[model samples]
Structure formats: C-alpha cells, structure tokens
Target: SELIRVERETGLLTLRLDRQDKKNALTRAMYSRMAEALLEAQADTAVRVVLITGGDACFTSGNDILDFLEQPPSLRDSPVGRFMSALLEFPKPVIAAVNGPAVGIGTTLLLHCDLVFVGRNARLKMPFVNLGLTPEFGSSLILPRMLGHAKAAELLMLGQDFSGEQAAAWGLANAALEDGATVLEHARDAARRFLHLAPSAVVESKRLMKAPFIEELRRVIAEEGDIFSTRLRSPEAIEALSAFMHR
Candidate 1:
C-alpha cells in the first residue's frame, strides 16, 4: 500500500499519511508523494481546500531516522531541500488534522498551514535543538510572528513537548478537541466553509493575507534547509539521534 493516500470529497482533498505502525515517520518516497498530491491540488480547480492527517494515531514523528542517516542532505539543492521548498510555497488553503504526536517537521509544518485542528492528547514539539539541529520549514520566521519572539524562543530554543491545550492557547492550532477522531470532523466542516466561499474570493483573500510574508518564508526556508543539511551530518546530531532512539 502507498505510504501517502490522497482522497477527494466535495472540493476538499484529504492527504493521509499512512505508516501508522511507525507513527507515520516520513520517508523520501512519502515526501515526494505528498508533494505530488499538493501540486495536483494546486492545479485542480475543484480542490478548494486541502487537509492533511495521519492514519490511526500519530500525525507524524517527522523524518524516518534510518532514512535520514542513510541519505543525509549533502548539498543545498538536494531532494529533501527541494521538497521543503515546494511545501513552503504550496498555494492553497492547507489544514492540518493533528491526531497524536507531531514532532520536529510535524510541528514545524503546522506553521505553514492556514488552519490546524489538534487532538486533546496531541503532543507537539520542535525538538531540533535537542537533536543538535535547527528548525526548518520556515518555522523560524512564522513561529516568532505568530507567538511572539519570547514564546517562540522558549519552544524552539528549549525543544520542549507542549500539550494540545497549550498549542491552542499559544495560537499554534486554531482548535483542540477532546478526541482525536473529532479533529478530522472539525477540519471537514472548516473545509466545507471554504468550499462554500467564491473560489476567486477565497484565493484572493488568502493571497492578500499571506502576500506580505510568503516571499520571506520561502527565502528563510531555503536558508534553513541549507543549515539543516549541514547539521544533519554533524557529530552532535549523530550523538543526539543515538540517544533519542535508545530512549
């Protein structure tokens, strides 16, 4: 079965990260497939909104450790870098239906999403520092803007796991539900609201709202990717990964 599944319903495109047994840790193939789905949604006029979610429990545990170890980014123009670039600039309303733990990239990706619905027990964190790395996917730019410099610094710098309620209160997510199953329900309802709006109007409104920061985000992500690539092969990162895996 495919690691990423794409389904469309009533102008909403749902992309499910399949690999639940491994907590949906993204592999190279999964990343490419997801990028393809997003690109297809961008070209499809019927897809007014795009929703991303996990299979059963966890949203994602970020990149697969084995995959990262075997194919760490060696250059700025690597596939992983390009994938990050593509996602950061994906045009359309993106919503994240976070069910469980959303770690590393999982948490950072939410910064790019327009709306986020997290489960009550969801654990969100940007543990890049803990892994001897830096935040990627434009989180460096968006987090501070959304949550203020001090608050963003605490999370990113400290690399702490925050609860769903805390995430909601800090504006990381639009809503938090008591049940993980309800996350998708709310996301579907929100997608319906977007679908009901005039397509051009919705697009224009999103463009207008995001115009001021889009280019900056794109640039910052590219820079972040470069830094990420460099850190991926560092001794500190190797030690951190070993400790994380053992723990």
Candidate 2:
C-alpha cells in the first residue's frame, strides 16, 4: 500500500498520509512522495489548492525512528530537505486537516500551511528538544514570532502536548472542530473557496504576506537541519530514541 496517497479532483490536490499501522509516521520515502506531489501541484495550474491529511485517525506520529536513525537527514540534497523546500516554496494555498497526534515535523509542517483545521482531540507537539534535536521547518523562527517568546519558550523547551483548541486559540490553527471528519471537510471547504477567487490575486496576496520573512525562514530551516543532523548522532539522541522505542 502507498505510504502517501495522492489524489486530484475538482481543482484540489490532496496528499494523505496512510501509514496508520505506525500512526502514520513519516519516512524518507514518504517525504519524497510529498515533495513530488507538491511540486506537481505547483506546476499544474488546474490545481487550485493543496490539502494534506492523514485520514480521520492521525495526522502523523512524526518521523519514523528506525528510518530516521538509519539515514539521518542533511539539509542539502536529502528527501527531507526537498520536502521542506517543496512546502516552503509552494506558491498556491495549502491547507492541513489535522487529527489525533501531530508530532515533530508533523506539527512544524503546519507552519507552512495557509489554513489549518484540527479536530478538537488532535494533539500537536514539537518534541525536537526532547529528542535532542532543534526545531526544523522554520518552526524555531516562526513559533517565537507568532507566539511571542514566552509561550514559544514554554512549548519548545518543554515539548509538551497541546490540544487543537489551544492551537486555534494560539493562532496556530484556523479552527478546531469536534471530529476529524468535520475538520477535514471544513478545511476542504475552505480550500474550495480558492477555486472561485482570482488565482493570480490569491497567489500575489499570499506572496506579499510571506515575502517579508521568507528569506529568514529559509535560512533558519537550513540552520536547524544542520544542527539536527549533528544531534541525531549525539549520545543524547541515541539514548532518547532507543528508550522511546522500548517504551
């Protein structure tokens, strides 16, 4: 079965994470598929919006520990890097339908999405520090800016779970609904709105809003990737991951 399911219809491109047996945990191959899907959607003018979901159960459990350990990622010429760039540079509006748990990059990827709707039961977290890693996907920069230093510090430093309602209240998600299905349809409905608007205007509006900090975000992503690579090999990460797997 496909790890990342790609479906296109009615001007919306949907990428679904389907590895539910492992809580839809992402692997390198999954990242490559996502990168390809986003790139293809960018080239296809017929695709008005891109929506990401992991069905109704889970968004993602974060990186697959075994896969991640076997081949730690570098910022340059890596599948993870490409996936990051694909989402970061994507021109069209992107939306996410989040449910269950979103961990590590699962949570960070939301930073790139234009709109996010989450199930109230969704659990979102960036456990980078807990894993002896730093933030990736420009989250270190974006979170502090969006959440202010104190809240960002508390979340990032502690790496604790936060509810979807808290996410919406904190301005991370657009809204939190009662169920995963509701969240997905809500996000999809929002994505459908883009189909009626002037495509150029929408793109330009998003560009203008993002232009001010895109460069810095890109730089921070690269910096975080570099640091994360080193940390993966450290004793702390090794012990943390090994213990986590055992648990």
Candidate 3:
C-alpha cells in the first residue's frame, strides 16, 4: 500500500494521503515518508510549494492507535517527533488542501501550513486534552499566536469539533470549498500565482514573517514533547487509550 503519494507538477509537490479504509490514519512509516518527501522537496529547486491532502473522504483520522500502542513516542526517537521537526524546518511554502476530517495531529499540523484550503465537510479537531495528552507540533505556541490566548485555550482545553466554515472564519483556513477537487485545484491555482513571483523573494518573505517565532517554536515543541510523553504513560492516558481501543 503506497499510503503516501508524492507528485510534482507545475512547481507544486503534492503529498496525498491514500488510505481510505482506515481514514488515512497515520503510522510511523507514513510519518517518516512525509518527512523524507519534505526534505527532498527542499533539496529540489524545481519544487516551489507543497500541497498536502487526503482526497475527499478524509485528510487523516489522526494516528493509528494500534501503531502508537506498539511503538509509543519519545523525545528524539519517534517518527512523530521527527516529522514535526521536518514540518517546522522545511524551508518552503507548505500549504494544505484539507478535503475532509482533520482530527488530532491532522488539525494541529495545519498550524504549520502556510495556507489552507478546507472542504465544506471538513471536521477539524484537536483531542489531545481528551486523550490525556497536551498539544504537539508547536501548536501550544502557534495556536495562541494565531487565535489569541483565550480562544486558543478554549479549543485546546475543550477539544471540540469545528466546521470548515468555522475554521476559515477563525483564520485557520484561507478558504472553504464545497467540493474536494475544487479545494485541491484551488490550491494548485494558488501555487500558480506564487510561481509568478520571484521564488527567492517569496522564500525570503516567508522566512522573515516566521523568523520571530523560530526560536520560540523550537522551545515550545520540546516542552510539549516532555509533557506529552509523561502524560502518555500516566493513568489517565492509560485509561483513555484502553477505552478507546476497546470501545
């Protein structure tokens, strides 16, 4: 199963998740492949932008619980950790064409995207708190910066679901399309617009915009990893995982 599909066309590198039976749930191998693809995109000058998505039915249901149970996660040894690092450090514009559900890391991962196109049916959520874990992927810091302290806390603490329109209004998504193909095609058009610009200037501007938060993101990712790792083994997490797995 080639769960992760990579395609490069017209200066856009599309990384599509292709496991519909499992709702494209991510596993260690999937995360590692994503990291490798992003790294390759950075090395290849022809790839100016990235569009990540999981077709129409789902973007990703989040991590495959069984995989997490088998391997777990740690500071430097986990695929999840390494992928987050690659996502943050990938020195190019990474956009998201979120066709459907973006749950857990699926949602938090959007915080790393430069632009987002969400389908009308997309259900966005971050259930870390519900799972007895804190946020990951620098989301604790980036979410607050994007949505303000109070709003960010509400979403993180409550772990409630939000619609695509709601996400766009909240500034999490640039556009919310009624159709999945349109979401992806719209992203391609956006990439085309970017292609008209001087690639070097575009990269520099993106860097300048994110420069202030680079160090802060680094520090927060480490802090979140520490708390998340601890919580994963705590009684609360054990009970939560047990019930989820069995239920």
Candidate 4:
C-alpha cells in the first residue's frame, strides 16, 4: 500500500500521510508522491479544495532523519525543496488538518496552507536550528510575515515546541479543536464553505494575496537549500543525526 493516500469525494481531495509507525516521518519518496498528488489535485477541475491530514495519531514527526542523511537535498535536485515549491505555487485552496505532533517541515508546511485546523494536543515545532540547519520550505520568510519578526525569530532560532493553543494565539492556525475528528470536521465544513464561493474568485483572491511573497520565498529557499545541503554534510549535522538515531 502507498504511504500516502489520496481520497477524492464531493469535490474535496484528501491527502493522508499513512506511515504512523514512524510517526509519519517524511521520506524522500513520500515527498515526491505527495507532490504528485498535490499537482494532480490542482489539475482536477472537479477538486475544488485539497485537505491534508495524517492517519492515526501523529501528524508528522518531521523529515525522516535517515532519509535526510541519505538523500540530503541540494539546490538542484532536492525532492523536499521541489515539493515545497510546488506546494507554494499550487493554485487551489490547501487546508491542513493537523493531528498530533507537527515538527520541522511538518510545521513549516502549514505556513503555506490556506487554513489550518489543529487538534488541542497538537505540538508544533521547527527544530532546524537544534538539528544544525536553517529553515527550509520558505518558512524563514513566510513565518516572520505571518507572526512578526520577533516571535518568528525566537521560534525558529530557539527551536521550542509550542502547543496548538500557542499556534492559534500566534495565528499560525485557524482554530484548535479537541482532537483529530473535531479538526477534520471543521476543515470539511470549511471546504464546503469554500465550494460555495465562486471558483475563479477564490483562486484569484489567494493568488493575489500570496503573489508578493511567493517569489521572494522561492528564491530564498533555493539559497537556503544550498547552504542546508552543505551543512547536512558537516560534523554538526552528523552529531545531530546520531543523537536522533539513538533516540
């Protein structure tokens, strides 16, 4: 069975990350498959909105450490970088129904979503600095714009794990519900609301809102990827990887 599952029904295409045993840690293949799914959903006229979720409890523990070590993404052929680019450029409403823990890229990906409904117990963190790296997925630029420079800098540089309530207070999520069902239900209802709006209006509104920052983010992420790839091969990342491997 595929690690990622796509279910299209009622003009809503739901993308599920299905690798719960590993806490849905994202592998390179998972990123590629997810990108393909997002592209396909964007091209499907019948699919008005895309909802991303994780099966079972864990939303995503973040990138698979082993996978990151093995296939470190450079500026040229970085699967994760490419996927982030595709996600930012996707022309439809992208909603994330966050469950348990959303760490690293998992948390950063929410910065691109149109709306995010997170569970009350959900923990969001971008521990890149702790892992001896900088932010990827255009998070360095997008987050500061969303939450202001001071808050964003502390969160990214300090690498603290914050609660869903904190995320809501910071405006990183639309709302925080008690659990997965509550969040998903809200997201489903929100998608229904989106369906009621004129498709062109909705698309154009999003495009206009995002246009100013997207290009700059894309360029910065490319530059960041180059630096990140070089750092991933360094002793600091090696030690960080070893610690995570032992954990």
Candidate 5:
C-alpha cells in the first residue's frame, strides 16, 4: 500500500511509484494498486489527467524480480498483466516524469504515456531479453514503429542502458532536462495545460490518435502474454534471474 501514493487535486491524479528503498521496484501488490488506480481514473469524471513519477532519485529500477519469481505473472489476469492492460487501455492523458533509472517495465511504460519528461540522470533499459523474457506492454509491436525496426531490435536484443538525452534523441521522450525536480515541475505544468481543456474533447483526440494501433496492440499484448509466461519458466530465465538475485 505504501509502495504507491495516489493524490488527486484540481482534476489531476498523481500516481507516484514510492518503493524508493528498492529503487521503486514494482511488486504484485504495487501493480495491483496501480491497476486499480488506472481503472478508477478511467471512470472518474473529475480526474482529468494522470501524472506518474518516482520522486527525485528514481522513477523505477524495474519489477521486483524476487517477488515475480516467487509468484510468476503467468496469467493474463495476473497483477502485472492486468496493470499492463489497464495502462494500454486508459482513455486519458497520462504524463510521466522520469528521473534516475527507468529500467525494464519502467522504461517500457513510457511508450504508453501520452507525454514524458526526463531528467539528465534518467536512464532507460529494457533488459527482458537479458532475463530470457520477451518485451511486455505491447513494446515489441510499439517500439519498432517508434524507433524503426533496426534500432528497436538493437535495444531489445542487447538489453542495454541509455541516458535521458538519448531517449529524447530516439524519440522516447518529449524532452530531456537538467534536473529531476525540474522535470516533475515541467510535467505538472504540462498536465495543467490539459486540465483546463474540455475533458471529452481531449480524451477523444487522444483516442483518435491512438485508434490506429489500439486494436492491433491489444492483440499483440495477448500474444506476448503467452510467450512471456512460458519464458518465465524457461531454464534460461531461471538461471538468469537466479544470478541477478544473488548479485
């Protein structure tokens, strides 16, 4: 419950990833809490926009692999999958202020956010392939379109890290800035811009923009769910995660 902090005011709903002691690593509980919040925001007429962040030091280091290893996210209705589905389908303006590290799903989740701002210290990585798992959050389908097949393939296969400026250059973020506090402030200002707009019109426009790929993305997510589940049980993943946990 303390892992995530949800605050609402002036038509803005801020979802803070708060597990900073572990670099805000996400667990099933945190994912479920986030999933529930997203669903709630979707239906709440007063919630005009959603802002996600992880405070000064981190956005997220990634999932709590030990937790996932203990309770694998193998079902479509599993907490992780449910949260991904909720994020993909949310019909509202979602903004992200990324500082420090945004690893694994942390990085991939940016692909779904309508607007993303990053700080100089921000680092992003999708190390699923390194963990012997496939990309989730429809990233396999979405990243290629955003960054071309060759670039996407390089990033996913290598499972490397990149700086915030690189993310902006690669078109993953709207802009890269000098500090985390500034990034969050800028994102909040950006949210305020939307907060003043006609909610229906803003939602409709975002929907229209996302419509071209929504259907296909959902199908791809379903396809990923099965492969991801299977991969989690593979000997390779077992070995990799085992090593990661130890080291």
Candidate 6:
C-alpha cells in the first residue's frame, strides 16, 4: 500500500511510485492502487489533470518480475489489466515525469500519457524480447505508428536503451529537461495549465483524437497481454527470468 502515493491538490491528482528500495518495481498491489486512483480521478469533478512520477533515482524498473512470476495475471480481470484500461480510457490530460531508469512497462506506460517530460539523463528501455516476451500497454501498435516500422523494430526487438534526449527527438516524449526535479516541475506546470482551460473542450478534443484508433489499440493490448501471459509460463521465459532474478 505504501508503494504508491496518491495526492490531490489544485485540480491535479498526482500518483507517485514510492518503492525506491526496489527502484520502484511495480507489483500487483501497486497496479491496483494506481488503477483505483485513476478511476477516482476520472470521476472527480475537481480533478482536472493526472500526473504520474517516481523518484529521482528511478522512475520504475518495470514489473516486479518475481512477484509477477508467482502470481500471473489475466488481461481482463487483473490489476495490471485494470491499470492499463484506466490509463487508456482516461479522458483528462495525463502527464508523466520520468527520470533515471524507466524500464519495461515504465516506458510502455508513457505511450498512453498525453505529455511525457523526462530528465536529460533518463534511461528508458523495453526489454520484452530479452525476457522472451512481447510488447504490452498498446506499445506494439503505438510505437510502430509513432516511430515508423524500422525504428520500432530496433527498439522493440533489440531491447536497446535510449536516452531521454533521444526519446524527445524520436517523439516518444514531449521534452528532455535538466534533472529529475526540473522534469517533475515541468510536468506539473503543464498539468496545471490544463486547469485554466475548458475541461469539456480538453476532454472532447482528446476523445476525438484517440477515438479512431481506440478500438484497435484495445485489441492489440489484449492480444499482446494474452501472448505475454502464455510466454511468461514458457520455458524460455522461465529460464530468462530465473537467471535475471539471480543476477
């Protein structure tokens, strides 16, 4: 429960990942808490924007693999599934403040955010292939559309790391800033700006922009999640994850 910190102030709902001891690796409970927060924020009239972030040392190291391995989840009913759905369907603006390392879902989740600001030194990577898994969180569809086919192939297949500057240049993030504090401040500033705008206009604009691909994106996420669950149980994944745990 302490892994996630949810706060509301000045029309902003901020969710901060707080498990710095484990580099903020996400677990089922954390996912549930985040999903609940998003759902609550969506229903609250006073909440205009949602900001998600982590500590200066790391944004998130991705799922807590050991936790995930022990309690595998289905895409439809699990906390992970709910979290993904909540973020995808969130009407208001969502901002991400990323610093240091943002691995796996840490980076994939940014794809769902309306605006993502990162520290210049932020390291983002999706190592699904390295773990014998595929992309999730709509990234399989979004990345190719955003980065083109070849570039997406390199990042998704090769599992290579990219800097925050490259993320901004590649259009994955809105801006690359000076440090963690600056990144969070910039994201908060952007979120606060939404407070002054017409909330309905902002929601309608976002809905129109996302409406066309919403169905397909949902389909791709489900497809990826199904395969991801199966792959998690495969011998290939078992071996890779086991070795990673030891390392």
* Tens digits of lDDT, candidate 1, 34-134: 87778878899888899999943689999888776777864346655555655666778889999888998899888878899998779999899988989
Clashing pairs in 5: none
Better of 2 and 5 by lDDT: 2
Q: Estimate each model's TM-score.
A: 0.94, 0.98, 0.96, 0.96, 0.97, 0.98
lDDT leader? 6
In Å, residue 174's CA in model 6 sits off its true spot by: 0.3
Residue 15's lDDT within candidate 6 is 96
Candidate 5 lDDT tens digits, 1-247: 5889998978899999988779999989998999999999999988889999998779998889897677677748788888888988899999999999999989999999999999976989999988888888888999899888889988888887899999998889999998669999999999999978888899999999999999999899889889988888888888898889889
What TM-score would candidate 3 get against the native?
0.96
Candidate 6 lDDT over 172-232, as tens digits, reads 9999999769899899899978988999999999999999999999899989999998888
How high is the CA lDDT of each candidate model?
A: 0.83, 0.90, 0.86, 0.86, 0.89, 0.91
Off by over 4 Å in 4: none
What's model 2's overall lDDT? 0.90
Per-model clash counts, in order, read: 0, 0, 0, 0, 0, 0
lDDT tens per residue, model 4, 114-170: 998898889899999998988887788888877789888888889988888888888
Per-residue CA lDDT of model 2 for 48-108, tens digit only, reads: 9999999887999988998767777676578888998999999999999999999998999
- Tens digits of lDDT, candidate 3, 12-66: 9999999899989998889999989999899999999998999866899898877
Instruction: Give the clash count for model 2.
Output: 0
Off by over 4 Å in 1: 74-76
Q: What lDDT is reached at residue 203 by model 3? A: 91
Error of 4 at 225 (Å): 1.1
Query: Between the candidate structures 2 and 4, which one is better when assessed by TM-score?
Result: 2
Runs of candidate 5 exceeding 4 Å displacement: none
